[PDB]
Design a protein around this ligand. Structure first.
Ligand code: HEM
Ligand code: HEM
Ligand SMILES: C[C@H](O)[C@H](O)[C@H]1CNc2nc(N)nc(N)c2N1
Ligand SMILES: C[C@H](O)[C@H](O)[C@H]1CNc2nc(N)nc(N)c2N1
Ligand SMILES: N=C(NO)NCCC[C@H](N)C(=O)O
Ligand SMILES: N=C(NO)NCCC[C@H](N)C(=O)O
Ligand SMILES: [Zn+2]
Lengths: 420, 420
């Protein structure tokens, strides 16, 4: 009937109804749990050769429209029926159909609302939508992307926004951003064996080089936008520095911290995800919210596969870096976390600590269960990379399921592309 | 064929073969992930009215024996066939069958080896087994339990051990320990609205009271062993204080920490789990390993539903306790963690920090994949309650599945019991 869910901190019980509306198949098998997998197929929406079969498209389209129209406080029945009619008509005449701007807006928010890996979802109703569905060239994509960065940044007072490019038609005319995120640093494998910058963007940095990009060989070199429009080969565009707002890292007590020469971009903007709504798919829809301190302090700065600054922040702190039991790592990471929070705060750049964020997500869950009987949640992603059980979300049992609309992952474009 | 598994820190890839030997059904559905659930039915082995049907028992028995005999470096084929024969014969003559001591030993280690929620599994081959299958009375159970505590404690130099009581026969003659763990503190709901001791053992403390136990009304009152033998009503036995070794908490720098009057028992011994091996089930088999610092420092001391000492350790540290963004909670918990590690170390009581433990588990995973093509792992339990991504296990993708033998959870006895 429904699944019982308990919060082991408050003791509160919730009943999940929403999981019934879930998609065909999720990430887990009957005899095994695959929730730990980063990129499961169930979370990926790949390439195509032909348009979406009419028989699959129509039911999905109708279902989305009913969801949309079933939203408003006082239903616009005539318009509801009228839209159902016009959409069917449009589908049988064009193959595909176009969403109204108000439907797109609703779609992007619901998709975000349905992101089981996002902890910022209490902000779901505050999202600026940039309609770039009429875009046709790489240069036009680039221009739209610049307006996005500029708007979202708002001189540190970050605003959530998303830019929707033309929907996938036949699949051989996809608009795609080859970057992971709008703003990201380069990673180079230097002559002395080491690695400079972001070691995660290594393979992609090479790709940019091979496409004629000028490697500035640093630690924080903002990578170029690699845009592909209407299926054509990707064109390389460098992002105007005036647009890339950064925060230089400094500890509020350790004056030697700034001597580390660390900084990070203020804009977290996912660039490679696909929006699925009512049978339609938008393989290019960069979006952004604002940063949660731990993303930078813990993952970007302390991951072994990333900047890996733990050992030296430990050393400069005077901790017993060669004795794991001293819990030096716990001490360092925390100080790096406050550096990040302090730095963003000082420079007036929006950011949220993982504790306040968790609390708000909990509030969101409560709002969501009451409002629609559920909230798809991926515990493994929602629980911060540090201070796990100190957070409320750690004690909250959750159900992870794929609804619709939804933001899917897609196969890396350079692996599946035509080179003319 | 097999599932590809990647470690995002080292980049290393492993192929899981073992998941094929998994049990009928796990915790997850086809369209939803239930990995976040604490007590799923797939991890629970409940009550019974009748013995295990012969047709189910035999294949399981044979399968276990083949596993057992397929273990030895040089197979004892004659004995293998001979055991297969004697076991079948014993089953068709008695209904059930008895494991040899060497098989039990193998069984307990494999079960531990198959515990997806245990991070201490690199120690799987070092386990003392106490054969109490001949036990018949509560007083005898109590005596066995005392020998266990005494042996395991070893005056601080903790030794992993397990005590196997008589296997479930018809199901109405079960030996069961009503306690969560061998040693645990009481929790009382005091007259002034507050709660003293362990708030998690509240309901159980009442049960002990209702059974004629003398409530000492403190914060660290070692609860009584509530034993049920051969299905008879549970008999209350108080644990001899000389057996319960404790560690008083003290910070190596904050002399005011001991003023908190905190301590914890040195022996983590799970008391309510069931061992399943070759179609057989032992609903009473208390076991223990040693503590991982975070269990005490983070969960026992900082959980809101437990001792909840975060706010005051924060206050005494002088931190901005009313400003979440100050990350005071991160600062406190870490200091509490070092207090625990320091205290156990000072008093010569075995303990392991979460970092060294994680590293060893990673080593175990590697050994296990090479040795048998897999390692059932529950990421949600294996990743420490603090310093998540600072740990290696956080970046390791894992498959969670139920093998055999296995340690299952069981329904709380007071909910399903006869009262004569
Ligand atoms: C308003 C502030 C927001 C905050 C603080 C927030 C925070 C986060 C965090 C911490 C993650 C995990 C990032 C990682 O570990 O790689 C995440 C993931 C995600 N968020 Fe949000 N978010 C916000 C806004 C948004 C918006 C506006 C959207 C979309 C319209 C969104 C969509 C998602 C999606 C789809 C993911 C999954 C990314 C992936 O799987 O790689 N978030 N968010
Ligand atoms: C040698 C040292 C060992 C260490 C450090 C270790 C550590 C741990 C930790 C941290 C947990 C999680 C506890 C919790 O969060 O409630 C756990 C769970 C578990 N361990 Fe181990 N363990 C060890 C030995 C053993 C032994 C000897 C057995 C069994 C023979 C075992 C069986 C299990 C099982 C079944 C669980 C699941 C408990 C549950 O689900 O509540 N462990 N262990
Ligand atoms: C292997 C594991 O799934 C992976 O490292 C995860 C864990 N949780 C998580 N959580 C968040 N928010 N971002 C991530 N990148 C990850 N990655
Ligand atoms: C709700 C959630 O599953 C629960 O709080 C979990 C998370 N992980 C975890 N991990 C460990 N080692 N012990 C626990 N008690 C829990 N409990
Ligand atoms: N807050 C968000 N989304 O809104 N972050 C997106 C991923 C950013 C990435 N984790 C980083 O820290 O670089
Ligand atoms: N280390 C183990 N098992 O071996 N712990 C078992 C659970 C103990 C419980 N987590 C506590 O801290 O009280
Ligand atoms: Zn699952």
């Amino acid at each position: 009937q429904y699944v019982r869910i308990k919060n082991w901190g408050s003791g509160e019980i919730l009943h999940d109804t929403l999981h019934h509306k879930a998609t065909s198949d999720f990430t887990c098998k009957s005899k095994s749990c695959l929730g730990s997998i980063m990129n499961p197929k169930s979370l990926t929406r790949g390439p195509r050769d032909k348009p979406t079969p009419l028989e699959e498209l129509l039911p999905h389209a109708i279902e989305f429209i009913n969801q949309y129209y079933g939203s408003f406080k006082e239903a616009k029945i005539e318009e509801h029926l009228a839209r159902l009619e016009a959409v069917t008509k449009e589908i049988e005449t064009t193959g595909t159909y176009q969403l109204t701007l108000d439907e797109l807006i609703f779609a992007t928010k619901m998709a975000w609302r349905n992101a089981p890996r996002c902890i910022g979802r209490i902000q779901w109703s505050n999202l600026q939508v940039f309609d770039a569905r009429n875009c046709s060239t790489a240069q036009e994509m680039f221009q739209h992307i610049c307006r996005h960065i500029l708007y979202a940044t708002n001189n540190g007072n970050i605003r959530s926004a998303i830019t929707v490019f033309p929907q996938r038609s036949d699949g051989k005319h996809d608009f795609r951003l080859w970057n992971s995120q709008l703003i990201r640093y380069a990673g180079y494998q230097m002559p002395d064996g080491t690695i400079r910058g972001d070691a995660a963007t290594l393979e992609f940095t090479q790709l940019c080089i091979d496409l004629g990009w000028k490697p500035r060989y640093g630690r924080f070199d903002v990578l170029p936008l690699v845009l592909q429009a209407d299926g054509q080969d990707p064109e390389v565009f460098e992002i105007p520095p005036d647009l890339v707002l950064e925060v230089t890292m400094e500890h509020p007590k350790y004056e030697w911290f700034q001597e580390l020469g660390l900084k990070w971009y203020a804009l977290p903007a996912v660039a490679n995800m696909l929006l699925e709504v009512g049978g339609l798919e938008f393989p290019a829809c960069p979006f952004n919210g604002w940063y949660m301190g731990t993303e930078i302090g813990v993952r970007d700065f302390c991951d072994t596969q990333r900047y890996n600054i733990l050992e030296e922040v430990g050393r400069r702190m005077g901790l017993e870096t060669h004795t794991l039991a001293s819990l030096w790592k716990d001490r360092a990471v925390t100080e790096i976390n406050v550096a990040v929070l302090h730095s963003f705060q000082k420079q007036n750049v929006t950011i949220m600590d993982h504790h306040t964020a968790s609390e708000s997500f909990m509030k969101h869950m409560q709002n969501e269960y009451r409002a629609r009987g559920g909230c798809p949640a991926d515990w493994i992603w929602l629980v911060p990379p540090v201070s796990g059980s100190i957070t409320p979300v750690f004690h909250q049992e959750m159900l992870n399921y794929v609804l619709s609309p939804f933001y899917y992952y897609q196969i890396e474009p350079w692996k599946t592309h035509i080179w003319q």
